[PDB]
Design a protein around this nucleic acid. Structure first.
Ligand SMILES: [Mg+2]
Ligand SMILES: [Mg+2]
Ligand SMILES: [Mg+2]
Ligand SMILES: [Mg+2]
Ligand SMILES: [Mg+2]
Ligand SMILES: [Mg+2]
Ligand SMILES: [Mg+2]
Ligand SMILES: [Mg+2]
Ligand SMILES: [Mg+2]
Ligand SMILES: [Mg+2]
Ligand SMILES: [Mg+2]
Ligand SMILES: [Mg+2]
Ligand SMILES: [Mg+2]
Ligand SMILES: [Mg+2]
Ligand SMILES: [Mg+2]
Ligand SMILES: [Mg+2]
Ligand SMILES: [Mg+2]
Ligand SMILES: [Mg+2]
Ligand SMILES: [Mg+2]
Ligand SMILES: [Mg+2]
Lengths: 60, 116, 131
RNA sequence: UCUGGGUCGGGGUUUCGUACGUAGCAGAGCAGCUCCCUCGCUGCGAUCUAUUGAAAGUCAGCCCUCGACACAAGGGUUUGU
RNA sequence: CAUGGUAAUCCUGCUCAGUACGAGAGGAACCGCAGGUUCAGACAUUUGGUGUAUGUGCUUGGCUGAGGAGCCAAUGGGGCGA
RNA sequence: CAUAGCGACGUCGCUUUUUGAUCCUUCGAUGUCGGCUCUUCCUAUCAUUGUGAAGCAGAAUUCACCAAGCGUUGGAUUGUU
RNA sequence: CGUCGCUACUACCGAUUGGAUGGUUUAGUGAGGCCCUCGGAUCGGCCCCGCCGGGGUGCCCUGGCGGAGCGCUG
RNA sequence: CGAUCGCACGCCCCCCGUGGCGGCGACGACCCAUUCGAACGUCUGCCCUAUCAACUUUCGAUGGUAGUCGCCGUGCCUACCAUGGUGACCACGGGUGACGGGGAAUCAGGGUUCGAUUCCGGAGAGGGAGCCUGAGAAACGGCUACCACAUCCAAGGAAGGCAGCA
RNA sequence: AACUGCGAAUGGCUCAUUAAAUCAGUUAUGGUUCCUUUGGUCGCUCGCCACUUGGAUAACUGUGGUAAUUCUAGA
């Protein structure tokens, strides 16, 4: 499950290819345009709240 | 731990529970039990059955202003350049606007003097 | 690959199921099931993915008084799918095939059980949807 | 016995599906009051809404209580190389 | 443990292998794998069946002055049901 | 090419799942067809296990041996066997 | 001239509760669209008004962050 | 009840001196007229058939009243009324190997056959049905759904309409 | 390139449907609608931006998803 993380204040969006579903289950069953504290993704994401903004199915 | 599906009643269905119904038209449903299945097969509306999730959120049972804009340097001008330009408040803009007036007056009168 | 697992049968000999292909038949009267050794007094019964011998009871007259192979693609009896889901369909249906497995017709109306799909690839290609 | 096991009660689970009563400028309307009111008020009215995923049952062969209550070192028949 | 009973059976698909063999047409087998049939012994987590828990709604006729609460109709009928 | 597989003319047997022959038991009565159900037994083995032979290249088939452990089904017509 | 016999052809009757194909409909189910009544996942403005703020003079011209007014609207 | 765009570029200066005027257009518009039209109406005219003589009238058939809807007039539809309407001068029904006409063939005169086909009008885009947009479409070299075909797939989906020229 | 405007409802093909229906002549819209062209009209109204007001979206940069399309998402 790739992640197109993007910061509007700086551009510099990048694609991160995670493999731990435990990191992503803080996102699971959250609608779009909702803010999730992404402290479940490693230690590099502390103090970070992120907003879901879409995605694509397995079929694109 | 598989996919959790939802019923006629909207309840969460766990693996090993309930049935799945595949109609000929291609739509497929799943039901938690035979109470939910029979209700669906009798064409009873889930929004009129009190214990249904659809009823409880229709009847509302049991249940801000943000604005930020950030200044960024653009292609053609650095952030230092745009800040100094937009911070000419102490009569620097007055200096530009007064040299503009004298240049406009002297150029317009000179253009009238150019012709004869 | 992997062989087909056991499912609930539901359709004995003498059951009239629908005909989901465009061959011009409206139903198939099951007269026997392929691969049934059988037992005393026990009717040979078939589920989805099973080859049967069937005679169309109504439909085009050129198909009527003949015995055709057929493959059950939908069954109205619930069957367990080795992962807890008990699936059943709105109706019993089948398609007319030859002994080689290819379908006489060219289209299938309605879903097709996954067990029947991966057992008969020629049915799978013509399937509108897989249940 | 470090008590025991009962009987009620409580909680849990679960089954059905939202109780009586009260309230409503909810309600097809209808019948009575019009100095009255400037759009109202007195009754009848299936049904609807809120109280209310409420009410009711749940071991008798469901689970846990240590809450209440009484009761339990008692009875009878036998048995020896 | 003397003694008595005694139980498992058969098939298909994949691979071997379009191989051996054969002029060609055709066309195997052992090892291994995945499953079935008939039989047997159980079991109820799940799906289904039952259902007088006479459990809980719905409902016809009647009956208790009415509401409420119920009851009778040899299980009144019917829905869901531990 | 008699004998892979067959076997005429003849001849020797076995079996009691055919049908006769007889009339020993039963006439102060042994309920007389078939089917359904259910168990067991026989082998003269249809299939399966192990084999031998062929006019057995493969496949399929046929003959024969040890062998009855297991199996031998669903139906239309007919009271039927 | 007719029956009878032979050979071709063409129609007819005929069990088959025969068969096939158009078209018009009763009734049942009913995809989809449109309209109406809702619904409100979201996206904005106003009330900003906790803060440094401020100027005709604590009585803000306001420059941005920020709380959130948990209200009024599109 | 113009917050639009180009073309050459000039006039007035008293109030002065920085502003007011200026020509050619282009784009635009609510409404009127015209043009291209469109739509529904009036009168008259059609092939064979009675082995089609009574049809329409529930579910509108005929008319009235009042509405809804449509661009408008009307049973177009709704409600309440009245029982009407059409037929041997052929209704109604059926068939057509029927798109209609301008026309074509044959020719004393009268007539008889053919007109799918390049002009005019109509209809249709495999069969029906429903619509978005637009002045104009029930459009199909637009969409939506069903039916009949048929396409590619990693079977998770996606995409169609030569009675246009070949 | 993309937004915007226009056109794409014309042409071309075919004759299945269609028997007072279409169509031909004739007549009406005083029962209607009409892009575009052209001609009218655009100071007729008393009523701290006008020296000109606001936000997004394209195109573009950048990250992709999908076996796949004139498929498209986030920033
Ligand atoms: Mg039997
Ligand atoms: Mg209790
Ligand atoms: Mg022993
Ligand atoms: Mg045995
Ligand atoms: Mg009653
Ligand atoms: Mg009562
Ligand atoms: Mg009594
Ligand atoms: Mg009685
Ligand atoms: Mg039941
Ligand atoms: Mg004797
Ligand atoms: Mg006797
Ligand atoms: Mg005797
Ligand atoms: Mg006896
Ligand atoms: Mg022997
Ligand atoms: Mg025609
Ligand atoms: Mg013509
Ligand atoms: Mg034409
Ligand atoms: Mg336009
Ligand atoms: Mg058209
Ligand atoms: Mg169309």
């Amino acid at each position: 499950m790739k992640l197109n993380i993007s910061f509007p204040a700086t551009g510099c969006q990048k694609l991160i290819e995670v493999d731990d579903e435990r990191k992503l289950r803080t996102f699971y069953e959250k609608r779009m345009a909702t803010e999730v504290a992404a402290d479940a993704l490693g230690e590099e994401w502390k103090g970070y709240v992120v907003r879901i903004s879409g995605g694509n199915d397995k079929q694109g | 731990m598989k996919v959790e599906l939802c019923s006629f009643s909207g309840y969460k269905i766990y693996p090993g529970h309930g049935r799945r119904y595949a109609r000929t038209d291609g739509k497929v449903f799943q039901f938690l039990n035979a109470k939910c299945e029979s209700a669906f097969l009798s064409k009873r509306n889930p929004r009129q059955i009190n214990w249904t999730v659809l009823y409880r959120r229709k009847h509302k049972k049991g249940q801000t202003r943000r604005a930020v804009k950030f200044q960024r340097a653009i292609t053609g001008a650095s952030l230092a350049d745009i800040m100094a330009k937009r911070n000419q408040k102490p009569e620097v803009r007055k200096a530009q606007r007064e040299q503009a007036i004298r240049a406009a007056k002297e150029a317009k009168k000179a253009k009238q003097a150019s012709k004869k | 690959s992997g062989a087909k697992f056991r499912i609930s049968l539901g359709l004995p000999v003498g059951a009239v199921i629908n005909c989901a292909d465009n061959t011009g038949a409206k139903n198939l009267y099951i007269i026997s099931v392929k691969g049934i050794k059988g037992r005393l007094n026990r009717l040979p019964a078939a589920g989805v993915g099973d080859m049967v011998m069937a005679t169309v009871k109504k439909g085009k007259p050129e198909l009527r008084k003949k015995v055709h192979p057929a493959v059950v693609i939908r069954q109205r009896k619930s069957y367990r799918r080795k992962d807890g889901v008990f699936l059943y369909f709105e109706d019993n249906a089948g398609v007319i095939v030859n002994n080689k497995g290819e379908m006489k017709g060219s289209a299938i109306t309605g879903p097709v059980a996954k067990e029947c799909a991966d057992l008969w690839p020629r049915i799978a290609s013509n399937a509108g949807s897989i249940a």
